[PDB]
Amino acid sequence: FTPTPVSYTAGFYRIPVLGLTTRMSIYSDKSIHLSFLRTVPPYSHQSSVWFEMMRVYNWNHIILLVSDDHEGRAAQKRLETLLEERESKYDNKRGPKAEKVLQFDPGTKNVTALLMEARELEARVIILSASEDDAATVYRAAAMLDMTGSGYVWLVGEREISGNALRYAPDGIIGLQLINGKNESAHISDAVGVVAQAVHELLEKENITDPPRGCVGNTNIWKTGPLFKRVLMSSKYADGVTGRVEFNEDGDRKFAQYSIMNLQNRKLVQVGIYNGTHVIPNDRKIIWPGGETEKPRGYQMSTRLKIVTIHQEPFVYVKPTMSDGTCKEEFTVNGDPVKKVICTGPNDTSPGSPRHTVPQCCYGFCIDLLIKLARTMQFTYEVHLVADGKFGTQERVQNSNKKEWNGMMGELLSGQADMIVAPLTINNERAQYIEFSKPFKY
């Protein structure tokens, strides 16, 4: 907050000021500060360069780890907002969408509960925007819990390519960097050129008649502060240390230029030159982590599944195991072998009572349908019953106007389950939350 104590003062009377070094996003809002005019694009915007990477790497599935504060808040806001393009009347190209955006807590020394529930997802790219304390635990976690395996693709912001992070930096990570970086001097010339271009335009109106000086007595917003600020932020020149220094819709340095660096296991090395859409890799070889060199497809479609199903006499019977860890065979009227699959039912004893997640081999009719499908589409599965014990409906919890899902439908839309096969109806209301097959018995 080293720039604040002056952003307020001349903010009173609304005297415009110019920002040089800091790059946090808080100072951008038009409601908390009427004073900043930013020469260095703040860390927020650098999200889009990743979206830009997506147009030449196609890893449409994607994981995000926003660290929870206003800093990361804006990062999530912006990245989420990027996807809203492609009205689709082109004609329906595959649109990259964010997967489970696992949020965070800044001051935390154990993240193990986050990575396995992350590693067991469907994607293979990691975009971590964070701070310097954060990369420490992030790396010291991922590099040891069997996370940095090959096929993993990483990205970070400008604040993770340095600090203690490098002193725990995993291989092949990728960073972002502006062409300038820090410069206590160069942008000064740029800014005074801005104010120059502003002055000789000020004569066009010059109805200000003063910016009120003196301490006491002149307690009135100078009636041309905002207008002169619009003027200043509307200053167009093209010759400083960077060309066409512009001011954004919110009034920030528009169209700066980046260049995608990279760590060579002990050495940062530039690869490309990022400029709006101008992002081209220079003379080098983009080496990817986990000991690999080909462009890795960020998707790994899984073959396992977890399927839940209900208890029902004509479709899915339930029988306890034997008395040693087995369960008993049986044949048909034609003596045909009927299948039986191991079933981890959490309901060894009835409701209104305890509940135990004992195995209890279960079979039926839809069981037969499932096994028929398995040999047809190269599957492998593990089955278990429903915790609650009813089809599943809508309701209102907290005895308030809330709305969610009970039963197996809820055990699925939780993200817990993965596929549902049982005698489940097909209504209208339950359609707007899920996709259904074709029908298989009227």
Partner: protein, 49 residues
């Protein structure tokens, strides 16, 4: 629209909404004019009497 079935060869190119009226290969039968029992003349009394 109109009376149109659903199979694979048609599910290849065009796409199909969820069907509304059921259908399928069925049978048609006809009733029978009465079935007077063969052992009628010993029916209307129990074994006791």
């Amino acid at each position: 629209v109109g009376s149109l079935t659903i199979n694979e060869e048609r599910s290849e190119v065009v796409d199909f909404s969820v069907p509304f009226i059921e259908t399928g290969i069925s049978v048609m039968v006809s009733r029978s004019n009465g079935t007077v029992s063969p052992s009628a003349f010993l029916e209307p009394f129990s074994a006791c009497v």
